[PDB]
């Protein structure tokens, strides 16, 4: 009953907050959540976004932001490779 509720709240929290490791989670599934949240905060704070912009040396800052956005999806590596 109680654990059974914890299963439903597992489904709800997983739905809202996306990745939540339940019991068995592949390193590909979880590391993707890591990358997504790290990039999420790098672009999310105007602070760290301004920082990565200069240290990277891009011509504009939104290039870095939308870069991180694109970098969230896995295929973006091969996308850069095809440029």
């Amino acid at each position: 009953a109680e654990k059974q509720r914890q299963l439903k709240l597992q489904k709800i929290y997983k739905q809202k907050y996306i990745g939540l490791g339940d019991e068995s989670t592949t390193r590909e599934q979880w590391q993707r959540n890591v990358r997504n949240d790290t990039l999420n905060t790098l672009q999310g704070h105007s602070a760290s976004l301004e920082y990565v912009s200069l240290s990277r040396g891009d011509l504009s800052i939104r290039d870095t932001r939308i870069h991180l956005l694109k970098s969230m999806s896995p295929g973006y590596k091969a996308y850069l490779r095809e440029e």
């Binding site: 996306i18 939308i66 295929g75």
Partner: protein, 243 residues
């Protein structure tokens, strides 16, 4: 024994100067008994907030408002059919619609309604960082970089009233560059660029949404796949003369 316990007193001597958000509304009427002019701007950097006027062709400090102690992740003014007060979204998920008022001998920033959304942190599920308001001010829309999008239907009365949120949830679609199209009162329509989070290939596809005031929900309209190279969207107002 003397406790080391260094006690530090933090002060911000000069306040954060990188201006991440702006709004065009006319907030306070100052030094003039009766005047209404749309020329004024309020600009926000995260915590710090400032309000400038021009009216002379030369910009002017109005007042530097008190420190909000949060990260403002988007700010947009709203104009409803009145004093134009700005809708402000930040961390805590709260949608905080604030009106700049003149209280005592200074300009203070009063809040009207703050609606709890997500949790308190900078998050991807957090319906912030992408915000826009109907150019006629009928509805405000917040979205998340990834998970979900919420759109409130704003109504004014003797007291301001924020309608219940309108939810759309696309699990794997990472949202970027919210841009809302103006309308003639027909129906609010907003446009986004959704990049799929989980996919074998990189696919960036634009998607249109028409919020239906009649059925009270957001409707996916046209999903157009464009090259992964996509950057941003802007709204062309009418093309009423052309076809």
């Amino acid at each position: 024994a003397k406790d080391d316990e260094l006690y530090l007193y933090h002060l911000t001597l000069k306040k954060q100067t990188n201006f991440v958000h702006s709004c065009i509304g006319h907030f306070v009427d100052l030094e003039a008994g009766s005047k209404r002019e749309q020329s004024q701007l309020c600009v926000a950097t995260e915590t710090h907030l400032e309000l400038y006027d021009t009216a002379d062709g030369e910009l002017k400090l109005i007042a530097k408002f008190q420190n909000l102690f949060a990260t403002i992740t988007s700010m947009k003014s709203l104009d409803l059919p009145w004093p134009t007060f700005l809708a402000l979204t930040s961390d805590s998920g709260n949608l905080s619609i604030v009106q700049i008022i003149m209280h005592a001998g200074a300009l203070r920033l009063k809040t009207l309604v703050n609606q709890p959304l997500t949790r308190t942190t900078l998050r991807r599920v957090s319906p912030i960082s992408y915000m826009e308001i109907d150019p006629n001010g009928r509805c405000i829309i917040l979205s998340s970089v990834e998970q979900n999008k919420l759109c409130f239907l704003v109504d004014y009365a003797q007291k301001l009233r924020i309608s219940s949120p309108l939810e759309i949830i696309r699990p794997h679609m990472v949202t970027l560059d919210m841009a809302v199209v103006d309308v003639n009162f027909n129906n609010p329509c907003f446009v986004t660029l959704e990049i799929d989070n989980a996919a074998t290939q990189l696919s960036v596809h634009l998607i249109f949404y028409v919020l239906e005031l009649g059925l009270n929900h957001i409707v996916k309209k046209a999903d157009y796949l464009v090259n992964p190279s996509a950057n941003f969207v802007l709204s062309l107002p009418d093309l009423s003369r052309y076809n």
